[PDB]
Amino acid sequence: PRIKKFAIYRWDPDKTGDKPHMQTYEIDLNNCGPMVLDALIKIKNEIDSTLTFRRSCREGICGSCAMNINGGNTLACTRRIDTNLDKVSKIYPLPHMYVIKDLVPDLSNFYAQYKSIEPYLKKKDESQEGKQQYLQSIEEREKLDGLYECILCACCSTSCPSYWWNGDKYLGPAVLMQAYRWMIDSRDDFTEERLAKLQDPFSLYRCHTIMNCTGTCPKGLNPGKAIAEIKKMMATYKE
Amino acid sequence: TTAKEEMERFWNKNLGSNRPLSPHITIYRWSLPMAMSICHRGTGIALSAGVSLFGLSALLLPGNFESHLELVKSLCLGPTLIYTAKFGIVFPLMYHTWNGIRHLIWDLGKGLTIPQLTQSGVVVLILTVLSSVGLAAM
Amino acid sequence: SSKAASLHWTGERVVSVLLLGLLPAAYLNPCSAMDYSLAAALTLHGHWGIGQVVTDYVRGDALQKAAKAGLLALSAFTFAGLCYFNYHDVGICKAVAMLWKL
Amino acid sequence: STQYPVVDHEFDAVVVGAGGAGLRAAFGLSEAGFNTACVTKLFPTRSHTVAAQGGINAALGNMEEDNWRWHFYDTVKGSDWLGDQDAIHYMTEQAPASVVELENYGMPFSRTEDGKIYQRAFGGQSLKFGKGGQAHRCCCVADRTGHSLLHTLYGRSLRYDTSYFVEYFALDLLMENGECRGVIALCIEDGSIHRIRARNTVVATGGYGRTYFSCTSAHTSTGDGTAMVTRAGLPCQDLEFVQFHPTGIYGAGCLITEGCRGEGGILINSQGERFMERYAPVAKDLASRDVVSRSMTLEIREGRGCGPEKDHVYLQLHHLPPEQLAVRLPGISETAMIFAGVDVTKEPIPVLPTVHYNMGGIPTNYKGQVLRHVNGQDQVVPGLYACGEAACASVHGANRLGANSLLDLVVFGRACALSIAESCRPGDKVPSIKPNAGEESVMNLDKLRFANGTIRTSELRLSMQKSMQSHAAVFRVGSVLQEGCEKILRLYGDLQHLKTFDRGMVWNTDLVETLELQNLMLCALQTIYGAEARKESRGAHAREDFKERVDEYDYSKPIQGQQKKPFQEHWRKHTLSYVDVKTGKVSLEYRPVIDKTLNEADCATVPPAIRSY
């Protein structure tokens, strides 16, 4: 016998004139996994099956279960429940997002912005591709460490106040870091023109180094450092 | 569908709907590096409001600066109250200056980890207090 | 394409290290020439500063243009006011010196 | 039905699934100038392919000199000779060409001193047709190869104008007179029913690992294509063959890569002695997936456990230099600490054989064409293709070799695309469908949406998961498999009793998981009945009552004066399963394994022999 309380953000689009409210659930942690998702599925399975969330891997990769737990954007399948019974876990959907239902946000814009930077290898002549493996030294490859691991959970971009006030025109850390990923990839021949896409007030320059992105990343990555590294390239690249 | 066409549909779908925005400032857990950022904007705005008031009053108010200080002297110049006025003027200026250096070190690429942000953040706070107290008495 | 955004960014940081240069320089050498330098660098850095606040918070077509025009006037008035103060009055450096030992 | 709005779509091709297989097939069709749609219940990136961590096999010869024909031998041997060699020939030849395709797309593979793709050892692979020792041909992106594979493909997929139906749940196949016309699907976003029709349909819905209580698979691995094909009356294949991966974490069941063992990792029991040295003398813990996990389960049986319950085994990593663990295996390094609280560099990981991969699936050509079984003979289902884990060209047979499914994905996704692009042209007549078509998919949706029953969707799902876990495990006997059958059959009758709570249209996750339950059940029935009928021990399927490997000949002694066993007397054949959706009865016939390759001169057939490592 060991009960923990969960306050969860709830909204039904199918119910007439229902507006957002918090609903509390109680869980015996002895009959539960260590993580928040374990509890989320537990209440979904045993208490209230009206609870709606995204999940898949229960492993910390896919990036489905991205949500605001106790004030910080992380992954429910990676974050363990605070065993402190006296405290009450507050579960919210990712900040400043259009809520489809309960904890399920509309990530369409986020995805679309990722499409706008062209996250694929680009050569000046792709007339020889699919027959030889491109050469990249161990050092040229280590530049991608800390960048490629990104899982597109959108925890960081949703922690950035710049992405709240200007989500429409500002690409956000997640997307920006991936643009940086393809910038320093030695195999990519489009390094200059990729930087040229950011030549406007909003796309990149809405970053003010608030560092909520790097602080919240459930994968331990450093998106802000990459943004600052972009800014330096933006200021130094010739022609 | 192109990326631009998708974003156009995203906004047309949501603005014309009854979907509510998830809370942001209301719910987000406040941290030192975060709190220190808004303060940089606050101090930036306050200082520009200071410079602009000081410049426009040189154009809109009669009499020279020397005579304007006699008005300050006229209302009894309290010993503690004059130090507080100097502290409250230097406090936002010194915060913004020291944090500006921290912002300029960042733009060079240096010191961009969460442990470093806490360390360098604290060092600004300590430098602000000392230089604010130090200058207010000269 | 042009480098119109990246040039503006570098400009911001340039005047910042310039303004960080002027504050100790004005104390150690308070004069007429340091008054105008501190007037130009101060109003510019401020003008670009509020511009970043305007671009972040002012939403709309008619409003974004209007606030920018409003800021352009206010900051130009601010630079004119300081230059007048340096030319026809004590000058900011000495003005700080007078205000301080009071 | 007049309560549900129906929107019809017209395309040249439909790909169901946006995993590794789906994507390669999806944009491969569009690359060939086809107006293609891709229907998927997850966002492409979220697909289970991200979880992949071992690697992708190709005989690129980056580390030692290699031949693709050696990779051929290892796959067919691994398959325990249930693997169709015509499709193994096709895949292992394409392997190098396929991996290079991915590297040129932008996949950030690890690198050698020469600067080429890094490969290393993996369980079951050898040089010189088995004679030349351990082979290093597992191409990997450090420890996150499947993640990089999925993102690179999705990255590329954006260059073409494929119409993606993101977060759309495919209900059934749009079948008409033994021909596929497309798919009917629910739009999870606004609860609307969509009829997407095309000349060719591709199914890449991945496996059904969620039929069991403990598995490395995602919550979304519910074999939804397997069920769709079943509901159409088409046969499924080899569903009793379920890959039990040796090294899954003791807690949540998460996968810890076989790459650990490929980099020098060791399996250990309570006594301290490296037990895999006794079971497999030569290859040791770098042997077949079914043989290693068999030894693990056997050590638990005999008291040699590990923890306080003595019910698991250890994977040791102390002796490996820390820098190797950081460069080669940072993925597990984090997830072993997260879930088991284990500092990889100091302590060993509590590992246990758990459900991993489904080599069974939809019967398939080497060209991707879905096969039905008429009059003891093969027959191509018109306009229906399947690839990946969802399919069964049986490249993997009775046991999948490690790092071969990510290969299977890319090779055969490409196959489906080229197999269409060279049978018809885009802008061809898109076969028309009845105004009634897909009626009982919508009518099934309606009943499950308002299902005012007595048994919860979760309670029945657990009952199914524990029943498969204890009756169809690593080892299984006749009597135990028997009890699992009428227990599973009773639970199909219990699908009539299910209670659902959410009555909403928008994002009814209560409803989609109920659809998934029907899907899992149909996958479960065919797994358990097919297993109980198979009275032999071959690959992953191991019978305690029938230890022998039953083939046409007793291949231990040389074939000469030996007499053939008739087709219906041995078990060296594919298990084909059907089920009448109403009564839930499993009927099963069979079809022979393909032993002729694509070219004998270029790749000589490998006849059955005693297989041990």
Ligand SMILES: *Cc1cc2c(cc1C)nc1c(=O)[nH]c(=O)nc-1n2C[C@H](O)[C@H](O)[C@H](O)COP(=O)(O)OP(=O)(O)OC[C@H]1O[C@@H](n2cnc3c(N)ncnc32)[C@H](O)[C@@H]1O
């Ligand atoms: C489980 C697993 C497997 C695995 C692995 C690690 C784990 C944890 N690592 C591997 C590795 O390193 N190397 C390798 O060769 N194989 C590895 N595997 C096995 C293999 O990767 C899997 O079999 C493979 O991931 C399966 O890929 P596939 O493309 O065939 O299927 P999927 O990735 O699981 O994607 C499924 C897609 O289908 C859509 N879907 C499913 N149902 C529906 C319905 N109802 N309606 C509409 N769409 C549906 C999903 O949206 C998803 O995109």
Ligand code: HEM
């Ligand atoms: C010499 C000391 C100063 C330094 C080193 C400095 C530096 C900086 C820097 C680097 C920024 C941009 C922060 C970023 O990276 O986003 C900034 C912002 C700003 N500063 Fe200063 N500054 C100084 C003094 C002042 C003064 C005296 C004023 C008053 C006019 C001022 C007004 C502003 C304003 C209005 C902003 C905009 C805040 C924003 O970015 O939204 N600064 N400062």
Ligand SMILES: O=C(Nc1ccccc1)c1ccccc1C(F)(F)F
């Ligand atoms: O924008 C913020 N300040 C800021 C803007 C530009 C430059 C420096 C700080 C900020 C920083 C941290 C937390 C919250 C905020 C916000 F909510 F939006 F007020």
Ligand code: SF4
């Ligand atoms: S940078 Fe981190 S928080 Fe942002 S999308 Fe990638 S993994 Fe998620």
Ligand code: F3S
């Ligand atoms: S939270 Fe922000 S504005 Fe930049 S440093 Fe991170 S993206």
Ligand code: FES
């Ligand atoms: S569900 Fe895969 S990241 Fe949480």
